[PDB]
Amino acid sequence: RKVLRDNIQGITKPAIRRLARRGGVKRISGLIYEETRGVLKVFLENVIRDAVTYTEHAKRKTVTAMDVVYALKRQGRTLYGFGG
Amino acid sequence: KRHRKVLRDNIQGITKPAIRRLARRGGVKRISGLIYEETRGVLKVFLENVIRDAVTYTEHAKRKTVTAMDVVYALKRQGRTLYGFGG
Amino acid sequence: KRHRKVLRDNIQGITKPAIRRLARRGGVKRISGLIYEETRGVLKVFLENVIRDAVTYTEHAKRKTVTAMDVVYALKRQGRTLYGFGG
Amino acid sequence: ARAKAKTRSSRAGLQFPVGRVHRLLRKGNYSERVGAGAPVYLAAVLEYLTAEILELAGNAARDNKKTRIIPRHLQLAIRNDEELNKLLGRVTIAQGGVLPNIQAVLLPKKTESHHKAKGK
Amino acid sequence: LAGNAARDNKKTRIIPRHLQLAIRNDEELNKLLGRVTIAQGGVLPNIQAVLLPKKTESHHKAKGK
Amino acid sequence: KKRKRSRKESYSVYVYKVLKQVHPDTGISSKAMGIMNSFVNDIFERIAGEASRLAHYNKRSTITSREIQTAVRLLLPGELAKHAVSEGTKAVTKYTSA
Amino acid sequence: KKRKRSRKESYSVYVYKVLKQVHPDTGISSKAMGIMNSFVNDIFERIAGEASRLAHYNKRSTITSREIQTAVRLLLPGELAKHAVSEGTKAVTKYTSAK
Amino acid sequence: KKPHRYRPGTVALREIRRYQKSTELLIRKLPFQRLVREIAQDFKTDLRFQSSAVMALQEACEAYLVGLFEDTNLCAIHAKRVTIMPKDIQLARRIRGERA
Amino acid sequence: VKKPHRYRPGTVALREIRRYQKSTELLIRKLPFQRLVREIAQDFKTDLRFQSSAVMALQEACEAYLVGLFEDTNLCAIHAKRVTIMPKDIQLARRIRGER
Amino acid sequence: KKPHRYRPGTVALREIRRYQKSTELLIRKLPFQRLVREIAQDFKTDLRFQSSAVMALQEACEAYLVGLFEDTNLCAIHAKRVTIMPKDIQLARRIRGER
């Protein structure tokens, strides 16, 4: 079952620090952990709503990797590699 | 006759009051003294970048006159999109 | 009213033959192709430096003409004493 | 009759294909009639730029003591340059990494910190 | 520019070395005091890249391939 | 049923050959071929995407060398523009005089 | 000019007629025609533009009605999309009946 | 409010309110004609600018500058200060991504 | 003998900003990120089946935008003389960048 | 037909011997008169140069250049090469201390 809470409590507190110690931050306040689950559910909504629209155009029911490489390209963040 | 050409005093042509009227439309309340030299650095880089792409389109058409549908076609690429002073 | 060209000689007149005449006095036998752009970059940082000190003396006397005794006085400070061109 | 022939690329001495950038420039509907002097110019600008991701990367593989140009060695060569980080400046490279940087103010230098029982 | 290089090395006195690490970095102050020798200064760290360890890899004959 | 798997087309033989002239000892792992085919297919899209706009703005119907050259002067940054415009001019000149 | 000179094309006559339907007894200045005529000529090059790429990825060679419906779904934003995908189909319905 | 003196920082709120409600350009037209002409000399000489080209450049350049100041202001109010300064302009340019 | 060399606050965090900035692997666990992508796609079209290379091209672009908003919230928390990123910093970086 | 093409590099030894035995300046006076005029514009405008000032600047500038090329040559003969190249000019300037 995709329990709503479980899916977002999936980005756990240790991995919201180790994804931030790769940027330089030395001390992290307690409330950063809540806001940073908010900004990764309003980014995935926008990338996974423009991969569904291309998938429907070709009358397919599987979201292929090339479609995500074409959803990201439109919004200004091209990804080179996991696609062609 | 006109025995003179345009020197490089122009970058100081923007006066101290003009940068205090384009910043009071911005919400700024107490402009600091050193800002006036910095704001003549940010404008100076920008005016060159729209200009180099503007000349590059004109030389493609082998003309000698930079018409405004060339500025409007340069400003789209960099980022903005002036609507109006052009077609 | 104005010479149409305003290039003020852009590091020009140092044509391939002139740099292949100065080098041969030096002892160079087979000058390579890329040297010509570089030797127009070393002449450039020298002609400016004798000049900045030369104008600095003339403005001290308030005169508007750079006489040769000013260039001999500037050249001593950097390190090379030209003997006699001005005296 | 009609003779025997050789590749157009060899005739102009360019390694990158000059007969495949003509089909891909005409079957994409970029323009109605392709000049024949344009496939050759555009198979040289790509090749000059290919070496800009194949030489700076290789020189950064010797420095880490390895003989293959793996995906990270590609980032340390397109993020350490000043005219190749202003072209590929939004692209994200798969399985890459970040360039090492720690801002100076954070580095340990509190100098005994102070405010404690007078260390005097 | 010398005190700021004493906090970085964790000391509270501007001793003679901390004076070289501040007059051998700034470009305006290394083109004025460019012949002077400080009394017990030392030198600024720099190892040329070509000789760094291995790099070209000391295998030579590398018998095999 | 039939075989005839669609034959995928990639610029990957040509990238190996440029590695060989520039460095004769190194080799590229499979992922770097992926992060390199994508680069070649991205600069081609920008240069033939500003050529087509230039051909149309000045009413015209063909992309000749000057048009594929105005783009390199605009899309590529500062230094790489000067070297690349020259590298192409030498390569086209050889084609005509042969 | 009139020395055998060329004639430009503007969507300026059409905009005036729309102004009359939504708000009667109101007028537009010629400076405000210039901002509006550019917008009608900029939304044409974004909605048509995504359609060209969509046709190529699929491999199909025609830009038909379905393609100008996926472009309106992606380029436009939230509730100015549901109110415009619906409006267009109604006009395609009527044309299919008569032309 | 003796016309002789209004306390510091109260004339400017009247200035902000009046300036935000009108659209006339704020840099003088004759001096800006020259800055563009000087910058053009290096790219080519013998370039003749039509009247509209120097008008558009005025209505884009004012707009980039009006914007940087609103973002510099947002940064200043963050540190508890109420005045723009030289350091604040640089944080706005690194974040927006222009300088690199 | 009660000294496990307890490190003072600040020496076990500058030995992790230096071991995570020199590696190429992915920090977020794969299985908990194969349920966030599916819950956010059970509202747009029901019964959509994701491929195995498109649940890794979404992890590598939602772990390279977060590590790009933590270098613009550690250049804004050093402008107010603090070393601790706080939730009023992440909100400022978004307004200037353009993503509000 | 007499091509009389001396083999490569033997015309130049005759050139070196003849050039080292005379003192006439090797850069033309009219072009040099202008390079100084351009580099003077930035420091001040309205500066008038007497005839001798351009002449002195020509003798010092030829002399710095003649020298850099006897030291670049000495560096080239060290690596076993016989021709000056762009890289050699930068070792001479780092060692002499000009930087």
3D architecture notes:
Chain D: The nucleosome is a histone octamer containing two molecules each of H2A, H2B, H3 and H4 assembled in one H3-H4 heterotetramer and two H2A-H2B heterodimers. The octamer wraps approximately 147 bp of DNA. Chain D: It is found in: Nucleus; Chromosome. Chain D: Keywords: Acetylation, Chromosome, Citrullination, DNA-binding, Hydroxylation, Isopeptide bond, Methylation, Nucleosome core, Nucleus, Phosphoprotein, Ubl conjugation. This is part of a larger assembly, with three copies of chain A, two copies of chain D, two copies of chain F and three copies of chain H. Chain A has 84 residues and is mostly helical. Chain A contains four helices and three strands; from the N terminus they run H-E-H-H-E-H-E. Chain D has a single domain, classed as Histone, subunit A, CATH 1.10.20. Chain F has 98 residues and is mostly helical. Chain H is mostly helical and 100 residues long. Chain H has a single domain, classed as Histone, subunit A (Orthogonal Bundle), CATH 1.10.20. Chain H is built from four helices and one strand; from the N terminus they run H-H-E-H-H. In chain H, helix 3 packs across helix 4. Chain H is flat and about 55 Å long. Chain H starts with 10 loop residues before the first helix and ends with a helix. Classes of the chains: A mainly alpha (84), D mainly alpha (120), F mainly alpha (98), H mainly alpha (100). Chains in contact: A-D, A-F, A-G, A-I, B-C, B-F, B-G, B-H, C-H, C-J, D-E, D-F, D-I, H-I. At the D-F interface, helix 2, strand 1, helix 3 and helix 4 of D face helix 1, helix 2, strand 1, helix 3 and helix 4 of F.
